Write a protein that binds this ligand. Structure first.
Ligand SMILES: CC1(C)CCN(c2ccc(C(=O)NS(=O)(=O)c3ccc(NC(C)(C)CSc4ccccc4)c([N+](=O)[O-])c3)cc2)CC1
Length: 164
């Protein structure tokens, strides 16, 4: 028993980060497996309603906070070795006491800022590694808080767009 959508932290971050990159027009090679994979068709109105909420809400939050996540980015510095180790330290502080919708969204936005940081210099591919770590930690901590407290749909119900 577990819904019938097929939610996946990996796919959620992939879609979110994708739009973040598309904004600039950088064809992110996320789906290296471009062999037309139409298993059960792309149609997924189920998890679709949640995607728009997370992607739209996430960006909405970051927009409300001009100086916080970006300002700190300067400390993150650029490097493929420390990048991985520096990422955890950032998400670790986000959820130090307890998790919440507002916190989840925050981390989500943070990951994108970092994934793009690499592209700023010359590490677009790094965007893939970022989404990977985000899915590990997200599910390592959030998935438990989200699933235990309803699930992905729980948030969409709370932040149900005007009518739709
Ligand atoms: C960069 C930071 C250091 C990250 C952590 N921060 C937070 C900021 C705001 C919240 C927060 O608002 N929590 S909430 O639980 O009170 C909430 C408020 C609003 C909304 N959704 C809107 C209004 C639809 C879009 S605007 C938005 C989205 C998420 C967070 C903040 C603003 C949701 N939600 O999507 O579930 C949840 C939590 C942490 C402070 C800045």
């Amino acid at each position: 028993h577990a819904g019938r959508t097929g939610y996946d932290n990996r796919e959620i971050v992939m879609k979110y980060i994708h739009y973040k990159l598309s904004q600039r027009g950088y064809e992110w090679d996320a789906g290296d497996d471009v062999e037309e994979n139409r298993t059960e068709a792309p149609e997924g109105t189920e998890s679709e309603v949640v995607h728009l909420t997370l992607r739209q809400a996430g960006d909405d939050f970051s927009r409300r906070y001009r100086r916080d996540f970006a300002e700190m980015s300067s400390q993150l510095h650029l490097t493929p070795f420390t990048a991985r180790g520096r990422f955890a330290t950032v998400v670790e502080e986000l959820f130090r006491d307890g998790v919440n919708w507002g916190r989840i969204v925050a981390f989500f936005e943070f990951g994108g800022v970092m994934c793009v940081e690499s592209v700023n210099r010359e590490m677009s591919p790094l965007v893939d590694n970022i989404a990977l770590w985000m899915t590990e930690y997200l599910n390592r901590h959030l998935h438990t808080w989200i699933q235990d407290n309803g699930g992905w749909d729980a948030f969409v119900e709370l932040y149900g767009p005007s009518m739709r």
